[PDB]
Design a protein around this ligand. Structure first.
Ligand SMILES: Nc1nc2c(ncn2[C@@H]2O[C@H](COP(=O)(O)O[C@@H]3[C@H](O)[C@@H](COP(=O)(O)OP(=O)(O)OP(=O)(O)O)O[C@H]3n3cnc4c(=O)[nH]c(N)nc43)[C@@H](O)[C@H]2O)c(=O)[nH]1
Ligand SMILES: [Zn+2]
Length: 326
């Protein structure tokens, strides 16, 4: 379906000045929050670690904490308690996510045409929504639950996995409670931008793969379907993170750049859609870094919404995506 999909990618490029100038003011607001945040004892040394869905922007504020100790919350491989001026957020020996997240919020309140709402949400001039997520930074080795994650050996190399896992990891105050959740959104950006088996993937005309186009098509497929099913709101829980995560699994499944040749955009997209479909139908989408953390368990998304999106994605697939027409 190259023609139809290439037309879609060409349509998306048309809003490139909208995504830029809208994030162009996200910038000057985030720098302003960063300035006065660095004036508070607890948030000194905070710094910047972007577009989720047209006009939905995400910024992560990283904060360097001293040596950190993690206790896995129950058997949820992603959620943890945290222990070691930061002393003010303590609940005994653990560091209170809910309480730290709370002072963050209030410092941004007195700093704010912007208005409020793990994410603190701003609204710049009504159109532009910004997610501002506080991230604790740990330079310790990654937690045990990531040992079998990041299965990039056959795709990027074994040595690249070793380089990636020497980098810090992050905890956002997202409670399953004073609990924090692992974050590797910095690693997600690295493997997205440095995505080939060939180190020179997409640096010359002989190596133009279609990995990034497939993810765009997949993000756009979900955005369009979510728009169409706005009457009965069955798709509210699915995000482009479910799409990005599935796209990482397909990259692991098709590790060679030859499996992402631009000429094959139609078949590559089909691989992304079929694997996403298998995830919905088996109620299993593994976090790329934490395999025993199922983003699609009936815990997070009930079975009816998943069965719903299957049928729609299945119909779209079997009919050469009429959602992409005209
Ligand atoms: N976006 C995102 N999701 C991630 C990441 N790593 C794991 N996940 C998990 O993927 C699922 C997709 O969620 P979403 O993006 O559609 O929405 C998530 C989350 O569900 C929502 C908060 O909803 P809540 O449960 O009602 O509240 P919460 O428990 O967060 O409240 P509190 O903070 O008081 O505890 O927020 C979205 N979200 C999650 N993490 C982030 C993040 O880092 N940035 C932004 N902008 N939004 C986020 C979910 O199951 C999710 O956990 C990951 O890196 N990104
Ligand atoms: Zn490439």
């Amino acid at each position: 379906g190259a023609s139809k999909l290439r037309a879609v990618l060409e349509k998306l490029k048309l809003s490139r000045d909208d995504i830029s100038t809208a994030a162009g003011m996200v910038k000057g607001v985030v720098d302003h929050l960063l300035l006065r945040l660095k004036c508070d004892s607890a948030f000194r040394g905070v710094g910047l670690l972007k577009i989720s869905a047209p006009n939905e922007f995400d910024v992560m504020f990283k904060l360097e904490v001293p040596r950190i100790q993690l206790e896995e919350y129950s058997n949820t491989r992603a959620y943890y308690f945290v222990k070691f001026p930061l002393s003010q957020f303590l609940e005994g020996e653990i560091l209170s996510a809910s309480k730290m997240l709370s002072k963050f919020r209030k410092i941004i309140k007195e700093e704010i045409d912007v208005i409020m709402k793990p994410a603190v949400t701003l609204l710049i001039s009504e159109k532009i929504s910004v997610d501002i997520t506080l991230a604790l930074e740990s330079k310790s080795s990654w937690p045990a639950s990531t040992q079998e994650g990041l299965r990039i050996q056959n795709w990027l190399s074994a040595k690249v996995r070793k380089q990636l896992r020497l980098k810090p990891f992050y905890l956002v105050p997202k409670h399953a409670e004073e609990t924090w959740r692992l974050s590797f959104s910095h690693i997600e950006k690295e493997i997205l931008n440095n995505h080939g088996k060939s180190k020179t993937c997409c640096e010359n005309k002989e190596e133009k793969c279609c990995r990034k186009d497939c993810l765009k098509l997949m993000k756009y497929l979900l955005e369009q379907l979510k728009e169409r099913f706005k009457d009965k709101k069955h798709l509210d829980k699915f995000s482009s993170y479910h799409v990005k995560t599935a796209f990482f699994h397909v990259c692991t499944q098709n590790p060679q750049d030859s499996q992402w040749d631009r000429k094959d955009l139609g078949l590559c997209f089909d691989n992304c859609v079929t694997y996403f479909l298998q995830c919905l139908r088996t109620e299993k989408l593994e976090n790329y870094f934490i395999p025993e953390f199922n983003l699609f368990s009936s815990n997070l998304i009930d079975k009816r919404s998943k069965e719903f999106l299957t049928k729609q994605i299945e119909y779209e697939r079997n009919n050469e995506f009429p959602v992409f027409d005209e």
